[PDB]
């Protein structure tokens with residue numbers, strides 16, 4: 001029997017088809033163009049570091065789909081097709097926003113400090129690629145930890161909360177903000193795949209719980225290192241804050257990131 | 272600039288999102304259950320060889336997505352996410368039909384003669400897997416030829432036409448038939464990817480046109496070998512034909528297959 005209708009990832013796959021119909025081509029970015037045009041040069045430089053982090057972050061999950069297919073986990077692989085399609089819309093949405101406000105050509109990589117690179121240039125592609133040649137429990141937990149629990153479950157979740165804190169209130173960038181709420185919803189499913197994947201391996205052998213915690217801790221310094229750097233950039237050129245009577249509470253944001261991290265650790269149980 | 276909005280595979284990707292919203296979970300198979308229940312044991316064995324061919328044919332296209340991503344073909348890779356998701360629905364639809372009429376447990380692999388295996392067990396996974404380690408023009412044309420032009424563009428297209436010839440007229444299996452029309456539409460896009468991929472490589476060096484033709488010809492004997500075998504099985508136990516005043520014109524079907532083959536060769540030009 002080809003499919004287990006009761007399998008959690010099969011149920012997550014059904015959910016993905018029903019809830020992941022959004023199309024980035026349907027979003028109206030015209031107001032966003034005006035909003036970015038109305039900004040001052042200084043203000044313009046304010047918003048770009050946060051948007052740089054998202055525009056780099058090619059289907060990172062591809063190796064995972066390959067490895068789980070090879071192990072015969074058909075339901076996981078079905079679900080992963082929706083994940084990879086979500087990644088495609090992700091890239092599409094930011095590229096349309098960038099083109100709509102005229103920073104399509106601009107090289108935002110300058111807002112990737114070293115800590116960012118330690119995550120997005122090394123730990124993530126390395127941990128995913130590994131799975132082509134080594135699909136051990138450790139390897140899989142590591143790939144799920146870095147991508148699902150850290151990149152998505154911590155940084156992405158915190159960047160989405162940040163965009164809303166700043167701009168939903170500013171009245172700015174209604175197209176981006178709609179894109180972000182769709183991304184955020186897609187990502188709920190991604191995090192559940194990660195949790196399901198880590199938990200099933202931990203269930204098998206409690207030693208893998210320590211490995212999960214250890215690897216969340218080893219990545220923490222670069223997560224907080226990138227947040228400080230953005231934080232510092234922000235504080236240092238917050239003309240946008242002055243202009244839009246915004247309270248960019250960087251101390252709040254920072255605590256939101258910490259809370260995401262501890263919350264992810266907490267969704268994996270030793271038993 | 273991340274995306275070329277004018278790129279053909281980007282336009283094929285936009286088309287895929289708009290036209291590929293079908294969900295196999297939304298199909299009503301209740302009548303199909305009744306229809307299969309109403310059949311005689313003999314009749315029941317009539318329909319299964321054609322359905323065996325489709326139920327085996329895990330994301331076969333995965334290696335292609337990996338290789339084109341590695342070569343920086345971002346638009347191709349976006350489109351391929353829709354392809355792989357279509358493959359997932361494909362597997363899902365047949366598994367739901369099989370479960371709905373009670374042949375979910377049954378081992379249909381017995382209707383795979385050797386010629387079928389030469390295609391679905393060897394040429395296809397071998398040609399796709401190759402791309403992980405060898406992504407030369409030849410390798411890519413070969414993968415596109417076997418999967419898109421032969422498996423989809425010849426066998427699948429001909430099996431869809433066959434199901435309709437037999438059952439749209441019988442009044443049987445309205446759920447399956449609706450599934451089939453969705454599959455057939457998804458496959459139009461798959462064939463266009465294959466054509467676009469083969470053509471772009473041929474454009475570069477006309478010697479690859481000969482290689483395309485040579486490899487279509489080398490696969491032909493197993494395509495026609497599998498068709499004869501089904502043909503022969505059919506002729507040999509056509510109680511379903513008698514019962515439903517069907518004219519299963521096997522000579523027509525056979526010519527339809529030949530026509531698909533020659534038609535695929537014809538969609539690739541030397542210049």
Ligand SMILES: CCCCCCCCCCCCCCCC(=O)O
Pocket residue numbers: 050053054057090151152155156158159162187227230231250253254257
């Ligand atoms: C000022 C506080 C800043 C909070 C931290 C911002 C983090 C930027 C996150 C971007 C990285 C995630 C991109 C890929 C996520 C995905 O798979 O969809």
Ligand SMILES: CCCCCCCCCCCCCCCC(=O)O
Pocket residue numbers: 321324325328361422423426427429430433458498501502521524525528
């Ligand atoms: C009696 C004439 C028979 C005609 C030939 C029938 C061929 C059966 C085809 C099944 C193989 C294709 C399955 C995979 C296609 C896909 O990628 O969606």
